[PDB]
RNA sequence: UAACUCAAUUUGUAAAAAAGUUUUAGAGCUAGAAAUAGCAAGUUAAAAUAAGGCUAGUCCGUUAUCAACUUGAAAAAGUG
DNA sequence: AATATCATTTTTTACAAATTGAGTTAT
DNA sequence: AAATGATATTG
């Protein structure tokens, strides 16, 4: 005999609550063993509790770091390739130069070669630096001067350019030739094109308004306003947007039908140049051939300040400028401080700590930090006018290596690197030979669709080798299969067929697919004429022409376009009604319209003899994005088509993948039938059934063939779509249940109920970039951490105006303005900004028992289309916002958002249940049907929430970690109630298998049956049918109150080994310490600094001896030593040696207790401690305030009737404060802190009812389980009191819990 | 539940940049036995960027998974 | 012991798959 | 983005 029982679960990112309830809504107890060496052979625990765990974590930080560490190894190899070239001819100059370079970091003692790296004396080295104060000086010289230079100074320039090579964002060779002499050349090449609209510049120097410090479109609106007669959305406007790095649309201007757009930083441009100038003539080339001169000139102007006349290294020469100015301006500010305020010299030029010039150079102070310190000393000191004008444009004392060198493309470095090579090959012969490689080394880059050049040891690699050999930048295209690999890169991510899980899946843009998508969507359209008694489905036999005419001849088909064109001509049918599709058919033949256009043929592109060649021509377009790859793949089928006919094929690319196979669409047929699902979706006779219909018809073998042709737990919890954060809860939820079921003598429960809970520059990336995209200079009138307050975020989100009625708005008296939800919170529980809108008055949106009325919808409807076009608000926000302009939320929509409030539709929640329902229900019946012994009830997350609000079971988060466990209990109760009082709903609330107020009443009143005061409900609620009673409002409503008063709750925190980085990443300078950790085996951090603050993986209880005196007389010890993440693998290989090498002697190998983090110690008087590492503990103690003082505190913080119970039963405060002190004294042991709490509770009794309540809630963080934390009692912060010794544990009682908490094993550490 | 259309999120992967940091080049100059005064400099660079690891790749090295006992390389099972 | 200071950062390109919420057709 | 262990300074 074991009684009927249920299970409640509350699944969080940080907590799984659980609870075990029985038939009369009670939660048992039980008397489990206690193993180990203690006094106690046993103990009684309640079957309610929680599991706390540290949040799980995304793979990103780890991925970023890994990708970031490949980059590092590759840059080492780049130089290691440059060096190997310079190998043999460098020896003939310098016996060992590259050797000085590798040991440069080494202090002079460990040094092997003469401490001077370049020349290996002083005279020459000292005299290298004078002559070339920056590498850039050596860069320019070597590029310009024609004198045969030193082979080493040549290596140094090359490597610098190769080592820090700049970016790969631009394709095609640009070449710096350069603003107002190149602008004017665009005004004139356009003036004699548009001879009727002759644009005039009239002397104004564009140079100025272009090469200024403002952003892209902001400098465009400075010129279109200047040139009055020219449209900014015109061609010269669109050709000023292509000149400052935007992407225009050139279609309408020349009368074209296609969105022919061009970006001037891709190879798709030179193809997309020949395709625009093959629609409009060849004489329209010197417009984009003027823009491309100006465009690059605009990419230059920004990143260099010198003329291309003087130099051939404008970058390097640009940098020399920044230097010279730095030299000049510094020199100035020197004599200028002497002259004026010499009293403040040492602080600026000598004291690093303070953010002066010393602090800029030798100190940790950046440019920003230095600029904001000196601005106020430049401003007072007269005769410092330009220095500020410099400063206040970001141009004062520039270093040549800056945050913003990120704009240099490798183009610009390839620039100089070539010149140098080009120079010195004349003299050195191995530069002529190897000019190729050296430039390639800079150039070559592993394409993203190959990934790691691995040889079958990389979990991450996927790329296929054409032959086996080492890969190089030079032998790469030969010894790697670029295409195969670029195929595999996709093929390995894209789904297989749900209905043939071995089979692949077709591209979203496959002809074969796109035919199937239309012929699914037409075989169900009905029509109606004048003389037709019932609306008839589409003519099976005569559909094979309704596609021929209307769907082929253009890319989108209109219901009016059909009802007119087919009913006017084809169908001779004057009027026509339509029941299938709304306004325009979802299914278009984008492919057919696109392919006809390209290949100029609907005779062979409508030719369903052989289609199989064209199946790979659209795969190739979807598979690949790098055009060069496309070129290869496509060359075969170019045998038929000419230049134009297999060249504008490289143009049209395709995006995406379909959800269905080639087989399932047009293979898997029937012997009984004699056609395929794509050939039966062309006339199911006079029936014309669907795709989904065709699958689940007993009439054919489809229904089974699919189920016919069809991993562990971890595996299955991995494969779920959701934060890996929650996927932790789900797995532990499943291990919890698995245990509970064993606790109940391996008897499955009756029921299981589940439940589940829920960048200020990133807001100024769509706020600032949305506001500043309508045009208004309002961000110049009223310009990050202010958006987190909700009304200021939303005020700045609506162009400083009302959202319903367009009025302008106020900042100072902005508190009177109310934040009305679009879909009233009565239907949707959206706390999100997407649903929340602010206005002068919420009563000025229209009634709150529907959607925003049609008048405001009319008025501000154009305004609502505007905010979307600027990206401030989305389609779903706008869509609903106008929903009264598309009918209004009906009584069925209402009824919808009142059921969706309580029925869980969220996909993860359903998957959780699918796992639990499968895991429990493992048996079958006589007809092969599943035995549903266990019922999985998925309940939304705001039944119990309000259930507590309603029947006074209020939760206070701050008191202890019990609520997560209570919540699992409550969910069981209500889960078992809403399943007996409405036992129909096991097909709405159970994983198994307008008169709209019917459903709205039902679901909006479903919770009411608990009550006895609606506007008069019975007592014993029951089944309306069966003699099964469910809720005895007398008795049941007081068990629950009872259960929440049980103080003993099983709270358990998962003991976790720590993983990840070894230590704070910061490389600290050389400190004579023992804490510093050597960054490399042979880099004594005495000499070279290193890391400190290792993370510790786990601690171990070492009991052994340690020699004492010069005697070496063994003393005995027993302590916690922490094994560090980095130490870990060494300690694990052989733990005795590891420790022996730490000083430990004759270690007791049997007594090494592995002690991971959160490991739980019971000291004395139930004072408990969890260790965080090896040398600090954290509060292991959970205090149970009685239901009494809990329920009080909600109201005391916060209808009119129970406000009485606040002032009455008041000065509970003293009894509450007490319990806390009788904790803070027993288990907590943080004296002076408690002796502030008190000495500051007494001080503030004159303060109100609530003020004293709120500040008690704060008080708990003292008694809270976990790590100590600071907290404010009114205006007195109280610092954390931490435990900074694990000595007190070493003799105490280590407790090993089980996941629930029920099965313990207590080990008393009185052992030497 | 399944296909479809339109628009946000989320997770996972690949290839790239610029910085930052550390040590070493970059002869400090005078007055003094020193302590310490004056004045001169400053912008650059090599190298490392998880210690490292064997599978030796232009690869891998920071996610996920973890009570205790007995059993297993492990995954995992058994135990109250 | 009480107390104070500390924590690598930013930027770009390419791809796939669920999920969510507003629509059409069904099982 | 905090939050909490490692670090070093205190009389």
Author numbering: 1 to 178, 181 to 712, 718 to 765, 776 to 800, 803 to 1012, 1030 to 1051, 1059 to 1241, 1252 to 1365
Paper text:
When the RNA-guided Cas9 endonuclease is in complex with a mature CRISPR RNA (crRNA) and a transactivating crRNA (tracrRNA) or a chimeric single-guide RNA (sgRNA), Cas9 is capable of cleaving any genomic locus in a programmable manner when a protospacer adjacent motif (PAM) is present. The most widely utilized Cas9 nuclease from Streptococcus pyogenes consists of a nuclease (NUC) lobe and an α-helical recognition (REC) lobe. The HNH-like nuclease (HNH) and RuvC-like nuclease (RuvC) domains in the NUC lobe cleave the target DNA strand (complementary to the guide RNA) and the nontarget DNA strand, respectively, while the C-terminal domain (CTD) is involved in the PAM interaction and contributes to the DNA target specificity. The REC lobe is composed of three REC domains (REC1-3) and plays a role in the recognition of guide RNA–target DNA heteroduplexes and cognate sgRNA scaffolds.
Recently, the SpCas9 variant xCas9, which harbors A262T/R324L/S409I/E480K/E543D/M694I/E1219V mutations, was evolved to possess broad PAM compatibility (5ʹ-NG-3ʹ, 5ʹ-GAA-3ʹ, and 5ʹ-GAT-3ʹ) and substantially lower genome-wide off-target activity than WT SpCas9. After screening various DNA substrates, we successfully determined the structures of xCas9 in complex with an 83-nucleotide (nt) sgRNA, a 28-nt target DNA strand, and a 12-nt nontarget strand containing different PAM sequences, TGG, CGG, TGA and TGC, at resolutions of 2.90 Å, 2.70 Å, 3.20 Å, and 3.01 Å, respectively. The structures of xCas9 in complex with non-NGG PAMs (TGC and TGA PAMs) display significant conformational differences in the REC2 and REC3 domains compared with those in WT SpCas9. The REC2 domain in xCas9 rotates approximately 10°, and the REC3 domain moves approximately 5 Å, compared with those in WT SpCas9. In xCas9, E1219 was substituted by V1219 in xCas9, disrupting the salt bridge interactions with R1335 and rendering R1335 more flexible, consistent with a previous study. In the structures of xCas9 in complex with TGC and TGA PAMs, the side chain of R1335 rotated and lost its direct interaction with dC3* or dA3*. In addition, the interaction between R1333 and dG2* was also weakened in the structures of xCas9 in complex with TGC and TGA PAMs. In contrast to the tight bidentate hydrogen bonds (<3.5 Å) between R1333 and dG2* in the structure of WT SpCas9 in complex with the NGG PAM, one of the hydrogen bonds between R1333 and dG2* in the structures of xCas9 in complex with TGC and TGA PAMs was increased to 3.8 Å and 4.3 Å, respectively. Accordingly, in our structures of TGC and TGA PAM-bound xCas9, R1333 remains in the same position as that in the structure of WT SpCas9, whereas R1335 rotates in another direction, resulting in the disruption of the interaction between R1335 and the third nucleotide of the PAM sequence. Notably, the rotation amplitude of the REC domain in xCas9 in complex with TGC and TGA PAMs was significantly different from that in the structures of xCas9/GAT and xCas9/AAG.
